[PDB]
């Protein structure tokens, strides 16, 4: 969860209450490099579910 909070903070500047999705679209475009880091997170997450 803490790593996913970082994704929130990188698009919006807030870990939780992003206020990012707005009527009309989103507030800001993804910062460069964010999608690589989401991919790295998602690559390993299923193993974390397997441990649970």
């Amino acid at each position: 969860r803490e790593k996913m909070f970082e994704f929130y903070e990188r698009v919006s500047g807030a870990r939780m209450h992003a206020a990012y999705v707005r009527p009309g679209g989103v507030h800001q475009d993804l910062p460069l490099g964010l999608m690589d880091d989401i991919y790295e997170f998602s690559k390993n997450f299923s193993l974390r579910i397997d441990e649970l």
Binding site: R1, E2, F5, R15, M16, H17
Partner: protein, 155 residues
């Protein structure tokens, strides 16, 4: 010299108390989620000696982590009164600090300091888990500065 002895005994009881702060398992709203992240591995509050305990009888700190409504106010005061002493209150987030987003509502207490005395205010909506930890360490340093025995000696 009594002054020297009471000074050292102050350091000991202060050190023991700040090194073993047991917050009450008590959370109100979204600020309580960041409080969970302070207990989570990245920050590991337990490594500072900070350990949640559900019973108010076994708690030293009340962290008011979220909005205090009028309906909830008597229960918050109740469990604070049931904490033995010394006890401390940390106000976490805008809602607890002064009402926040809901300041002008008919159902919200405009700051938990209308109900209980507050030792530390942690700003944010929510404060980050690190911000809350900064507030806990600020409380520890406040306890370190206490002069209970030195003042008693000079009474």
């Amino acid at each position: 010299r009594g002054e020297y002895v009471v000074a050292k005994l102050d350091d000991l009881i202060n050190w023991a108390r700040r090194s073993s702060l047991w917050p009450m398992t008590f959370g109100l709203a979204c600020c309580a989620v960041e409080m969970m992240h302070m207990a989570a591995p990245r920050y590991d509050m337990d490594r500072f000696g900070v350990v949640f305990r559900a019973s108010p009888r076994q708690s030293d700190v009340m962290i008011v982590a979220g909005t205090l409504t009028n309906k909830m106010a008597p229960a918050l005061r109740k469990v604070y009164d049931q904490m033995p002493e010394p006890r401390y209150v940390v106000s976490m987030g805008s809602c607890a600090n002064g009402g926040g987003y809901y300041h002008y509502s008919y159902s919200v207490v405009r700051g938990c300091d209308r109900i209980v005395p507050v030792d530390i205010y942690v700003p944010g909506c929510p404060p980050t888990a690190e911000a809350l930890l900064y507030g806990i360490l600020q409380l520890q340093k406040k306890i370190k500065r206490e002069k209970r025995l030195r003042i008693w000696y000079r009474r």
